[PDB]
Design a protein around this nucleic acid. Structure first.
Ligand SMILES: [Mg+2]
Ligand SMILES: [Mg+2]
Ligand SMILES: [Mg+2]
Ligand SMILES: [Mg+2]
Ligand SMILES: [Mg+2]
Ligand SMILES: [Mg+2]
Ligand SMILES: [Mg+2]
Ligand SMILES: [Mg+2]
Ligand SMILES: [Mg+2]
Ligand SMILES: [Mg+2]
Ligand SMILES: [Mg+2]
Ligand SMILES: [Mg+2]
Ligand SMILES: [Mg+2]
Ligand SMILES: [Mg+2]
Ligand SMILES: [Mg+2]
Ligand SMILES: [Mg+2]
Ligand SMILES: [Mg+2]
Ligand SMILES: [Mg+2]
Ligand SMILES: [Mg+2]
Ligand SMILES: [Mg+2]
Ligand SMILES: [Mg+2]
Ligand SMILES: [Mg+2]
Ligand SMILES: [Mg+2]
Ligand SMILES: [Mg+2]
Ligand SMILES: [Mg+2]
Ligand SMILES: [Mg+2]
Ligand SMILES: [Mg+2]
Ligand SMILES: [Mg+2]
Ligand SMILES: [Mg+2]
Ligand SMILES: [Mg+2]
Ligand SMILES: [Zn+2]
Lengths: 127, 60, 78, 24, 124, 98, 155
RNA sequence: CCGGGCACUCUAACGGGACUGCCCGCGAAAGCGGGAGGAAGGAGGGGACGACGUCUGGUCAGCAUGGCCCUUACGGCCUGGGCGACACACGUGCUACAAUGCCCACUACAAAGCGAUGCCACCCGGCAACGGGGAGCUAAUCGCAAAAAGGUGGGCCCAGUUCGGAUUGGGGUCUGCAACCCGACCCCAUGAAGCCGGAAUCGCUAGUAAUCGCGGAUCAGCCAUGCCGCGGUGAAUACG
């Protein structure tokens, strides 16, 4: 019945659900290709299914919260993987080989005092 | 003139406008806090001793 | 900018109003460069303070919604 | 630009609201 | 078409056109459409002969509109000259006038940076 | 029905003092909702180390205000004796409602 | 850096044509971290390839690139009395970088009002073999060889 | 939203984890390069942490403090002025010179903080700043609140322009006894220099630079474009 994976990527938590059937995709109450209209990176989150090859099979029901639309697309791209990895003891041959598993620890770092932007150091006179 | 001031500050009779702050420990008018009641100088000092409840060398 | 009042200090009109009595002399000093000019207060040259001395400034209708301060120069070398 | 009061941005940058950026 | 004084915008849309008049900004522009009645997207080249009139009428008639406008402006400043109120001067001395830092900037009311100069420090 | 708050500072104590009010709230009758740790409100403030002029290398502190909630389902005259008289907060603070 | 040899950052394949050599470009096209605008332009440019040419977009871009990778450039050097400009080989790594770069710059240097069109046409010319890049490549070429004298400083 | 449910998410408190223990290569060792499993290796990536001493460094104006000096004043109060002066030079900054743009209507994705004569929903008045009413909050359970860039479609058309908002005139609002010197917003009208900056020179090696919006302290109000923080989008390059 339900197939879930914890979608999380840079202050973005996505809830992935996979129901066999058509292929319809939903997020926080909207059609995938509608909630992400404009973002040419949208069709990237579904890329995991496109290599398992098994797209026309899971009516995925997601709900991502927190972060940025793109960040969300990342959280999702991990859920769609973490979710279906569960219901396929053999589908491990992709989440490890085709690097689809990493929280991307890559995240914004604290702004140190005396550095306009956590690193960009102020100007300089000397004279 | 920093003695007569601490007192002058305490008194308040005139227009609430002029009612201004000033460090509790040291007679300092600049960089005080609506909390602690201490000045940056003072605060950090006490802070290091521990006499400032729940206050801890921040870390994140 | 005052739209309900006129913040024009009282020890002025007080001394201006009593002077309004048949209208006598005029020489009158003050430190209210912060108050406003009152209509009909023309002819009442009011020396205003600036921090140094009192500028013997005449006062006429041309100037009214102004402050006696605008009329007193605070700094030197204008 | 962020410097024109009579503009959505300008008003925003200034942290204000008004005829060019009303409160809904 | 000469709508005002001696001003005539061209081959553009009226909403932008009028702008080219002293006294008429973007505001008063659309302010003469709720009372005039015309579709802004229209170029000044093509448009009913009457529209121009009903336009010019409103515009010129309503308020006041280059010269004399531009002329009143002076007077005020002239008036500021009176006995010499503070804000009155500054215009007199050609300095900024709403309290700013003449020390550094203010080059907009100040004359080109008339350099001239100054201090020297002993080498030995 | 009766609600109880738990602020304070050292989450080392507050945790215990709170936890106590359950192992002792069950023995007094009605069941209870396990010590729930709600979010922490924090007080951060920076200061310029030097007492003069050194806007850099300054130093800021924190003041973690831990909160903690727990609640009894049914108000037994039993529990009352305990809670009301078992006031044992070293540096803790507790608010109670309904 | 003096320490390590430094390893090349890898890129994520395109979403439309799926090719790093593409993303690379889009990136170079991107100004102020705004990819959506960076990609569109690029693609919108291809949507203006079929018209100006019944060619497969992917191949024009691919060619344009090849038509600019500078076989060789000159890099300064100090010795004494004056500085000789030594001419030497160029690994694809830098070639691609250069080529790609020149493309974008050249584009924006064009007089086409829209951006799509610029990258667009620019791509075509290059692809063909006569674009600002082509020139900026040729120039670099000229520079070298001519300085073959000092070439014996390959270092 | 109601009943109801801890599975998610999360909040916050306690644990396991990674130790060169495995394999190959080099060696006397320590230990280097390669590889698998793994979320993560060989200090995993950031914080806190800065030796003996150095600059007769800084600060007697935060405080403490030896010596010196003043006492109807070198002490104290007060109203007014000043620290905001301006022919000029520099430092750091902010907004820009535009179509990878600007404007306008609509529609989304944050994090981190903050709040008692305090933040204000929601109404009615006003073009608006804001003002009369008035619900909720002792605040993961109400408010500040809107993220902006983005996405949609609509308007400009390469022009000092619908680029850019300085300057000034007129009309207002709010805090405060009080905005002349000297506050910040608002609206109308003005639309300045600037079409990318000499000699020079700065920052940054990845979630960094660049770019966009947000919180807080101080604080009636505010000259904050500052500072201290948060998050969104998200690169180029490193032969040597
Ligand atoms: Mg950032
Ligand atoms: Mg410095
Ligand atoms: Mg004194
Ligand atoms: Mg005050
Ligand atoms: Mg503009
Ligand atoms: Mg020589
Ligand atoms: Mg390379
Ligand atoms: Mg050996
Ligand atoms: Mg560490
Ligand atoms: Mg010294
Ligand atoms: Mg002392
Ligand atoms: Mg005074
Ligand atoms: Mg003053
Ligand atoms: Mg100063
Ligand atoms: Mg000034
Ligand atoms: Mg929304
Ligand atoms: Mg915050
Ligand atoms: Mg919060
Ligand atoms: Mg209503
Ligand atoms: Mg009220
Ligand atoms: Mg009210
Ligand atoms: Mg202005
Ligand atoms: Mg430049
Ligand atoms: Mg140049
Ligand atoms: Mg040079
Ligand atoms: Mg670095
Ligand atoms: Mg801010
Ligand atoms: Mg404030
Ligand atoms: Mg100011
Ligand atoms: Mg500053
Ligand atoms: Zn103090």
């Amino acid at each position: 019945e339900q197939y879930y994976g914890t979608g999380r990527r840079k202050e973005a938590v996505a809830r992935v659900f996979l129901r066999p059937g058509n292929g319809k995709v939903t997020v926080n109450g909207q059609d995938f290709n509608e909630y992400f209209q404009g973002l040419v990176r949208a069709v990237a989150a579904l890329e995991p299914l496109r290599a398992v090859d098994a797209l026309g099979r899971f009516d995925a029901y997601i709900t991502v919260r927190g972060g940025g639309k793109s960040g969300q697309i990342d959280a999702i791209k991990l859920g769609i993987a973490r979710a279906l990895v569960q219901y396929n003891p053999d589908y491990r041959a992709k989440l490890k080989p085709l690097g689809f598993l990493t929280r991307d620890a890559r995240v914004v770092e604290r702004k140190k005092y005396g550095k306009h932007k956590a690193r960009r150091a102020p100007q300089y006179s000397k004279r | 003139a920093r003695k007569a001031l601490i007192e002058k500050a305490k008194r308040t009779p005139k227009f609430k406008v002029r009612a201004y702050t000033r460090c509790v420990r040291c007679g300092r008018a600049r960089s005080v806090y609506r909390f602690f009641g201490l000045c940056r100088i003072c605060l950090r000092e006490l802070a290091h001793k521990g006499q400032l409840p729940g206050v801890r060398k921040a870390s994140w | 900018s005052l739209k309900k009042g006129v913040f024009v200090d009282d020890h002025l009109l007080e001394k201006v109003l009593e002077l309004n009595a048949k209208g006598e002399k005029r020489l009158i000093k003050t430190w209210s460069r912060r108050s406003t000019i009152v209509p009909e207060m023309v002819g009442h040259t009011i020396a205003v303070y600036n921090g140094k001395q009192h500028v013997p400034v005449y006062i006429t209708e041309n100037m009214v919604g102004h402050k006696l301060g605008e009329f007193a120069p605070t700094r030197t070398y204008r | 630009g962020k410097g024109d009061r009579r503009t959505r941005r300008g008003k925003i940058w200034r942290g204000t609201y008004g005829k060019y950026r009303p409160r809904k | 078409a000469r709508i005002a004084g001696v001003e005539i915008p061209r081959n553009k849309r009226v909403d932008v056109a009028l702008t080219y008049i002293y006294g008429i900004g973007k505001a008063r522009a659309k302010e003469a459409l709720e009372k005039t009645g015309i579709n802004p997207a229209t170029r000044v080249k093509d448009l009913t002969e009457a529209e121009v009139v009903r336009l010019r009428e409103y515009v010129e008639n309503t308020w006041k509109l280059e010269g004399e406008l531009r002329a009143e402006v002076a007077a005020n400043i002239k008036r500021l000259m009176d006995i010499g109120c503070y804000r009155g001067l500054r215009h007199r001395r050609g300095l900024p006038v709403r309290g700013q830092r003449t020390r550094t900037n203010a080059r907009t009311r100040k004359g080109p940076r008339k350099t001239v100069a100054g201090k020297k420090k002993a080498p030995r | 029905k009766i609600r109880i708050k738990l602020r304070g500072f050292d989450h080392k104590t507050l945790d215990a003092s709170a936890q106590k009010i359950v192992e002792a709230a069950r023995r007094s009758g009605a069941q209870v909702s396990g010590p729930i740790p709600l979010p922490t409100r924090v007080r951060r403030f920076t200061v310029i180390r030097g007492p003069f002029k050194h806007k850099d290398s300054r130093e800021h502190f924190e003041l973690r205000t831990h909160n903690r909630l727990v609640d009894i389902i049914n108000p037994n005259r039993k529990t009352i004796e305990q809670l009301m008289t078992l006031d044992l907060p070293t540096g803790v603070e507790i608010e109670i409602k309904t | 850096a003096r320490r390590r040899r430094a390893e090349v950052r890898q890129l994520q394949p395109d979403l439309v044509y799926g090719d790093v050599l593409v993303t690379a470009f889009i990136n170079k096209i991107m100004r102020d971290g705004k990819k959506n605008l960076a990609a569109r332009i690029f693609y919108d440019a291809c949507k203006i390839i079929q018209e100006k040419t019944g060619q497969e977009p992917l191949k024009v871009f691919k060619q344009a690139v090849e038509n600019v990778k500078p076989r060789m450039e000159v890099r300064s050097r100090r010795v004494g009395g004056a500085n000789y400009q030594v001419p030497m080989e160029v690994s694809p790594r830098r070639q691609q970088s250069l080529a790609l770069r020149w493309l974008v710059q050249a584009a924006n240097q064009r007089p086409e009002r829209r951006a799509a069109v610029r990258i667009a046409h620019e791509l075509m010319d290059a692809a063909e073999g006569k674009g600002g890049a082509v020139k900026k490549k040729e120039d670099v070429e000229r520079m070298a060889e001519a300085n073959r004298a000092y070439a014996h400083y390959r270092w």
